[PDB]
Design a protein around this ligand. Structure first.
Ligand SMILES: [Zn+2]
Lengths: 48, 98, 147, 49, 1091, 49
DNA sequence: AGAAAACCCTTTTGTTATATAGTATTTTATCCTC
DNA sequence: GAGGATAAAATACTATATCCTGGTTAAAGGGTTTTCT
RNA sequence: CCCAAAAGAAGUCUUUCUUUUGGGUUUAACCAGGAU
């Protein structure tokens, strides 16, 4: 947890149609096996 | 220019190649359609994998076996004719068919 | 005349000579770029380039023998035709006539197929590459993270 | 592409009959087909641009 | 229903179906036993096609024999194919990797045409794979299925096209044979009726006609009624007949010395010989129908004839003339019209029998060439039939087909429904059919002739949409291969029960009514006007006096998978499709449960799919146990049924079977006696009934996500079992001495603890990633390499079964091995984030957050809801069906009682008897297209029993009042609650997650490999380097393409800098660039890097 | 010729470039991606580099 | 001494292609001119 | 009547998103050699 | 660059240093089936 602090990570989805398909977030640990995504960017990625 | 490589790139220049250049690139002549001998599982001689043309298959190890130590470097084998060097040279040397 | 002038001017301006069109020697790609894979059980799968080079070498040896041993012009001419076809298949398989097929009636990947389409070393191994420090997963929604 | 002059007369709450459902699938499928082919085509135009 | 021991599942159906659903696997089983000629098929063809019963092998042999030399001095013939008993039973063949087959023998007779010496022998023709009784072949231990193919039927096809330059209609005809050479007669601008013999250049038909022996007088005598024919006659430039043949030779076969004899021979051999032009039997029937030549004579002969060619030319010219009907001398008149190539009267179905017959045909052709050649290089009076037959090509062809093809596919065994739907599949792509990348939008549509022959809903969603479909419930394949459907015939407005099977053409000719029409209980329509289907698929109102046929019942258009969706007629086709493609991807759960609201089709699908055990004969149960069941038949005999316990399926799901009978019960023939993977008492059970609310909740179920309660984890309500298989073979090798030994060279004592004396993990030890399963050492060529098979990356779970095959035990091992130890590892996966639950109607989602059981919206009495769905997804996608289901689900759970105190209420007048009242947890069924109306649902919801105390939790609208468990206050407005049947799809997260820091690299180019297996690294594709360029970030792109992928020194230097805290070094150049330079130089291009 | 060769008609572009003996000055964004050097745009330009 | 099973080499009728859309270059066919 | 010039047709080449997993990877014939009877 | 084994030295009751040998591509191409 002390290593990843303030260490950006790139998230991408395919197809990457337009410029906003690749975005850099800050990672935080969660429980399980699924990447958690912010709901306000689903339109940019076009991800359901 | 720049021979092998490393960042002095300033221009790529393509062009037709003549027979003389083709015979310049090659380190030997392939004249036998044998890939590898099954029993020895080692390259044939004068074939499509000959070590004398394209280089040794193992790091600092000649085909005959007269040399297997690093200190021996650059000595063209006096018996088998394979140059003692690193195996990566098999990714660079080219042959030519006459 | 205008459509022709392009190539004549191109060969006129530069010091290069047209004799490069007709080959006298055929280069051979380094082995590591056409490796054979010895899958378990002696299943040595060979890259198509190996088979095409094998054909060319066989025909060249046969023609050399026939010339040295002495033969009528007709047989030598036919052997030269076969050599010409073998080289044509080596450089661009399927451009003229029936493709040289191998196991199970399939075409063989000559050299020119390594630099073409979405399988060549121009748009599948130079513009986009697999990378380290990476992963993938299924995404879910969390209305607790900030933006 | 021409309209069927029947036409459908029932709402999905009341439930369609058999024939009406058939003539509905008629036009329903081409939507998916065109979706696939157009999403295939768009990439070529983006690449050339 | 009619199954002796089926559960009592009450139905809302109003209509009655005269015809029971046929055997759902009958297509395959009855299309194969035709091939071998079993007595059952002989009996079936006796009551139908008794004129000429012949099996596929018999037909091939008769067409082949006799084989004669050019001189005709000797001949070889075959006859009477015969089959022996199978070598081993099904279970043993599956376990020991032995193909399921039987010997084949044939009687070969050799006759010398100058001595009269006849020599007969029985020659062995190889091992012929047979078919298990449930429709599947077994090959090399795996189970395979052969899919039927849709192809364009052979015959004559006419079509007209508009001309751009001149705006004239141009008609064209194609005579497409089976294994022949085409010939097209087409008209064009500058009207000129030409030919295209084979696929060569054009030429006037008059050339062909004269070549056939027609004088310039005869043609104008008969073809004297059109200007085009006379114009072509005027401009022919062909003299006599010989010049015609020579000209034909100059085009058919260029660059040859033309001569009359050879030209005539070649022309005759192309078409008029039963050697290179076979219209089969279907083709000849179709041609005779289209031109009406021989209506009476039986179809015996499959080559063209001059009369057919002249008839087709006349037909084409008349069609261009605009005629309406034509009369051919010696034949009845027919209509002249263009043809369509999607009408299911023109697309035929090559089933499993036909494909194997074709493969045997080509194998025998090769064997025939061999025998003909050998017939002239061996001295007479030493030749015996066994010394001329070479069997290898036939077995080679059969094996090639069954191992390598686009129609012999691995069975999909996610669950029984997947198999049942895979056997009844029709694929239009394969050898001899269109291709996935070369199909237009005119073949993927749904032609109006599909009604009742191919389901319009069930179809893949990807790029295959339209090329693959499923055979409907009632359809059958007639002898020629055209698909037929039943219709109940009406005589004088009286609906009889005479069922007649019709193909596409006959259905086109007549007028057909609808199944769910107002019958007045005496076979008479209530009102004169009723929807019908006319010739071209038009829907219109015709009075109830012209109707000629009616559908046997509704549902006739929906395949097996789509017939199991309740309230199908309320859902849009687009979502019913995703509902019918998401029942073939369930996963057999640890404990199964039958759905509360089904569609009456579960029982038949379960019993036919073959995954349940069915008592073969009536009797009384003697002893029952988890392993086997003993049935004591009525007359002495006794039978023992063995059960498959924890057997791996082709896609990694368990295949349990447990009995449902006790030691004293009596069973009846056809009764279900043991459940299967996804069955519950004989009914399909793909999922679970969960309590569901339809409110949006805190955004966790945002954009199709789902929320589960924790009760679905504690109590294993959704808990699957998966099984993985690991193999390793100790190859003999040229060096030899490979052995599966325990002692692992250069190994620790702890890591070797589990291994048994032989060197195989003890059954019952948890082999987590990084353990040993087998100890294998092979010579180095000690001089050995320890290829000790280890648990690959990401697996775990106990070891439930080992199987070791030994050469010393004289097993059938692969050539050049001694042992083939194989291990199984099994694991129980619970539900968790990332899974892909989905209902039936197409409401797919991925579990978003498994909340603890305390903070869930709970009803007034304390019951917590077990799932939450969004409201914003229902109305927009038009799958309202689910909401209706939800309501009905609740009515099924709570149990209702319509109060018939003073007359039945009007809304329940037509409700069937013994449905006015139901006990709690009562199962009901609503057939697909005749189900529970809205008024009936309102009535049921209006009256429902209290739960325990005198409280009703769901009011009339169907919405209850929920307490918010997280905060405490009640939600201001009522919410919908009910019971919905949801499944667990096979897209679990644990098979998807993957990461890589540093791992294996490729060999030709130094980039990392791809895929979760090896170690794999994600691909930074082409259009993910445009986004980086667009942002303006350059350093990140440079490092993503140089020091992370293929810069040989960059990788090690960055690793060292990172571990030692230094600043990352600079990049070099990529290896793939040098590979490109070498590839260019190999082409004689002098590429040089100037400076 | 590198960019054009990587775009379309690889054979024709390569052959005509070989005939004309064209020398490709390295400027653009596709060739600098190919040879693993900083793109001459964004952060890579001289003013900010 | 003859027969049967095991090496070493070679090499793979016209099939079946249900294609469109666009452009670019070679025939060839016919029309116009001298 | 013969030759040249222009439409026509006739062929030749080029292109038609992203990602993931599972099964196979040669046979067949001719010529030659060794062991068993 | 990395790992494995053998021997010697120091301390801890198990880590570091030195020497010898061995080593690293589960690669690859096809067909098929899926996902968004
Ligand atoms: Zn040496």
């Amino acid at each position: 947890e002390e290593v990843i602090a303030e260490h950006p990570v790139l998230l991408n989805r395919a197809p990457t149609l337009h410029r906003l398909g690749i975005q850099a977030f800050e990672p935080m640990l969660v429980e399980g096996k699924a990447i958690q995504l912010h709901p306000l960017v689903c339109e940019a990625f076009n991800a359901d | 220019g720049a021979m092998l490589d490393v960042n002095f790139f300033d221009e790529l220049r393509i062009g037709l190649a003549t027979a003389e250049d083709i015979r310049q690139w090659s380190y030997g002549e392939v004249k036998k359609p044998e890939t590898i001998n099954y029993r020895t599982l080692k390259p044939e001689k004068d074939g499509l994998f000959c070590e004398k043309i394209f280089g040794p298959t193992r790091d600092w190890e000649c085909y005959c076996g007269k040399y297997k130590r690093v200190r021996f470097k650059g000595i063209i084998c006096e018996r088998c004719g394979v140059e003692v060097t690193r195996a990566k040279v098999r990714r660079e040397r080219m042959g030519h068919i006459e | 005349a205008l459509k022709r002038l392009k190539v004549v001017a191109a060969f006129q301006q530069s010091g290069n000579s047209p004799m490069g069109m007709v080959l006298d020697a055929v280069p051979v790609i380094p082995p590591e770029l056409r490796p054979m894979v010895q899958l378990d059980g002696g299943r040595f799968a060979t890259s198509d380039l190996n088979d095409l080079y094998r054909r060319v070498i066989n025909r060249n040896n046969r023609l050399k023998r026939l010339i040295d041993l002495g033969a009528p012009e007709i047989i030598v001419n036919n052997e030269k035709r076969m050599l010409q076809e073998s080289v044509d298949a080596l450089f661009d398989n399927g451009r003229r006539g029936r493709p040289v097929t191998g196991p199970g009636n399939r075409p063989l990947k000559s050299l020119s197929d390594l630099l073409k389409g979405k399988q060549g070393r121009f748009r599948q191994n130079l513009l986009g590459k697999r990378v380290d420090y990476s992963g993938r997963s299924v995404i879910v929604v969390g209305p607790q993270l900030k933006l | 592409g021409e309209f069927i002059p029947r036409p459908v007369k029932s709402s999905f709450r009341e439930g369609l009959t058999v024939l009406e459902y058939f003539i509905n699938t008629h036009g329903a499928r081409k939507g998916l087909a065109d979706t696939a082919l157009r999403t295939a085509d768009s990439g070529y135009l983006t690449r050339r641009l | 229903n009619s199954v002796p021991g089926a559960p009592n599942r009450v139905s809302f159906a109003k209509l009655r179906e005269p015809l029971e659903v046929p055997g759902l696997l009958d297509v395959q089983t009855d299309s194969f036993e035709w091939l071998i000629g079993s007595p059952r098929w002989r009996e079936s063809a006796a009551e139908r096609g008794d004129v000429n019963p012949v099996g596929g092998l018999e037909e091939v042999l008769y067409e082949l024999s006799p084989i004669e030399d050019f001189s005709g001095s000797m001949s070889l013939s075959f006859s009477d194919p015969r089959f022996d008993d199978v070598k081993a039973p099904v279970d043993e063949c599956k376990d020991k990797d032995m193909t399921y087959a039987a010997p084949l023998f044939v009687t070969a007779e050799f006759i010398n045409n100058n001595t009269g010496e006849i020599k007969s022998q029985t020659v062995f023709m190889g091992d012929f794979p047979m078919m298990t009784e449930k429709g599947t072949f077994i090959i090399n231990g795996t189970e395979r299925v052969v899919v039927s193919q849709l192809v364009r039927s052979p015959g004559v096809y006419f079509d007209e096209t508009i001309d751009k330059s001149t705006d004239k209609t141009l008609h064209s005809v194609k005579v497409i044979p089976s294994r022949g050479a085409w010939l097209e007669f087409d008209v064009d601008k500058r009207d000129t009726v030409g030919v295209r013999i084979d696929r060569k250049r054009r030429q006037p038909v008059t050339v062909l006609l004269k070549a056939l022996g027609w004088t310039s007088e005869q043609i104008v005598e008969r073809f004297g009624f059109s200007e085009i024919m006379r114009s072509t006659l005027e401009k022919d430039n062909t003299v006599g007949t010989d010049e015609a043949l020579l000209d034909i030779y100059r085009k058919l076969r260029p660059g040859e010395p033309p001569t009359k004899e050879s030209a005539q021979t070649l022309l005759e051999n192309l078409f008029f010989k039963e050697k290179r032009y076979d219209l089969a039997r279907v083709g000849r029937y179709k041609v005779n129908k289209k031109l009406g030549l021989h209506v009476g004579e039986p179809i015996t002969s499959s080559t063209l004839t001059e009369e057919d060619v002249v008839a087709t030319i006349e037909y084409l010219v008349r069609l261009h003339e605009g005629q309406t009907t034509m009369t051919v001398p010696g034949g009845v008149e027919v209509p002249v019209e263009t043809d369509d190539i999607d009408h299911f009267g023109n697309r035929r179905l090559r089933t499993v029998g036909e494909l194997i017959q074709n493969q045997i045909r080509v194998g025998m052709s090769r064997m025939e060439r061999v025998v003909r050649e050998r017939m002239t290089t061996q001295d007479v009076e030493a030749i015996t039939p066994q010394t001329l037959i070479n069997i290898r090509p036939v077995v080679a062809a059969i094996k090639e087909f069954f191992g390598t093809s686009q129609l012999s596919q691995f069975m999909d065994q996610n669950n029984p429904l997947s198999g049942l739907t895979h056997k009844r599949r029709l694929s239009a792509l394969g050898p001899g059919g269109l291709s996935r990348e070369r199909a237009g939008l005119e073949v993927r549509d749904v032609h109006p002739s599909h009604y009742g022959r191919m389901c319009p809903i069930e179809t893949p969603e990807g790029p295959n949409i339209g090329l693959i479909g499923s055979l409907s419930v009632y359809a059958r394949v007639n002898p020629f291969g055209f698909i037929e459907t039943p219709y109940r015939k009406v005589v004088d407005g009286v609906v009889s029960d005479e069922i007649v099977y019709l193909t596409a053409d006959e259905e086109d000719r007549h007028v057909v009514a609808q199944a769910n029409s107002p019958i007045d209980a005496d076979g008479r329509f209530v009102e004169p006007r009723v929807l019908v289907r006319r010739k071209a698929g038009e829907v219109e109102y015709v009075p109830s006096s012209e109707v000629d046929y009616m559908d046997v019942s509704p549902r006739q258009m929906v395949s097996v998978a789509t017939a199991m969706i309740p309230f199908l007629e309320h859902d849009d086709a687009n979502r019913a499709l995703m509902g019918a493609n998401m029942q073939r991807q369930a996963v057999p759960l640890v404990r199964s449960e039958a759905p509360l609201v089904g569609t009456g089709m579960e029982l038949r699908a379960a019993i036919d799919a073959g995954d349940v055990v069915v008592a073969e004969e009536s009797g009384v149960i003697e002893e029952v146990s988890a392993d086997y069941i003993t049935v004591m038949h009525d007359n002495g005999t006794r039978r023992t049924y063995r059960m498959r316990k924890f057997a791996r399926s082709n896609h990694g799901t368990c295949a349990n079977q447990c009995p449902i009978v006790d030691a004293g019960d009596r069973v009846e023939a056809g009764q279900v006696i043991a459940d299967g993977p996804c069955t519950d008492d004989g009914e399909m059970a793909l999922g679970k009934n969960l309590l569901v609310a339809i409110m949006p909740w805190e955004g966790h179920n945002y954009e199709d996500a789902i929320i589960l309660s924790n009760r679905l984890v504690e109590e294993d309500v959704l808990t699957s079992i998966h099984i993985e298989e690991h193999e390793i073979d100790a190859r003999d090798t040229k060096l030899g001495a490979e052995e599966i030994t325990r002692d692992i060279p250069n190994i620790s004592d702890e890591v070797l603890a589990d291994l048994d004396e032989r060197g195989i993990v003890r059954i019952g030890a948890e082999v987590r990633d990084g353990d040993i399963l087998v100890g294998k050492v092979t010579p180095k060529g000690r001089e050995v390499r320890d290829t000790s098979l280890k648990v690959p990356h990401g697996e775990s779970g106990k070891v439930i079964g080992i199987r070791v095959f030994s050469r010393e035990d004289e097993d059938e091992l692969p050539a050049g091995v001694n042992e083939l130890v194989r291990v199984y590892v099994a694991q129980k996966r619970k539900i968790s984030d990332g899974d892909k639950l989905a209902g039936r109607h197409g409401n797919k989602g991925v579990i978003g957050k498994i909340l603890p059981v305390e903070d869930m919206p709970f009803l007034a009495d304390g019951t917590p809801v077990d799932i939450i769905l969004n409201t914003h997804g229902v109305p927009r996608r038009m799958n309202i069906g689910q909401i209706l289901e939800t309501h009905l689900g609740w009515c099924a759970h709570s149990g209702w009682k319509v109060d018939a105190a003073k007359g039945v209420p009007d809304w329940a007048a037509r409700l069937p008897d013994e449905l006015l009242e139901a006990q709690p947890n009562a199962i009901v069924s609503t057939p697909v297209f005749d189900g529970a109306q809205e008024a009936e649902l309102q009535g049921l919801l209006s009256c429902t029993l209290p739960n325990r105390d005198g409280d009703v939790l769901v009011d009339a609208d169907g919405k209850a009042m929920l307490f918010d468990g997280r905060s405490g206050e009640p939600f201001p407005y009522p919410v919908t609650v009910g019971y919905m049947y949801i499944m667990k799809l096979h897209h679990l997260v644990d098979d998807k997650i993957h990461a890589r820091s540093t791992g294996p690299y490729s060999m030709i180019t130094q980039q990392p490999l791809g895929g979760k297996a090896q170690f794999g690294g994600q691909r930074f594709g082409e259009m993910e380097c445009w986004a980086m360029q667009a942002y303006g970030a350059a350093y990140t792109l440079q490092e993503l393409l140089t020091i992370k992928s293929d810069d040989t020194v960059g990788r090690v230097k960055v690793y060292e800098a990172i571990v030692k805290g230094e600043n990352i070094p600079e990049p070099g150049i990529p290896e793939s660039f040098k590979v490109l330079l070498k590839e260019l130089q190999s082409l004689c291009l002098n590429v040089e890097v100037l400076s | 010729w590198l960019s054009a060769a990587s775009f379309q008609e690889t054979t024709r572009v390569l052959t005509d470039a070989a005939i004309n003996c064209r020398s490709d000055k390295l400027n653009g964004l596709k060739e600098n991606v190919i040879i693993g050097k900083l793109i001459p745009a964004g952060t890579g330009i001289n003013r900010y580099r």
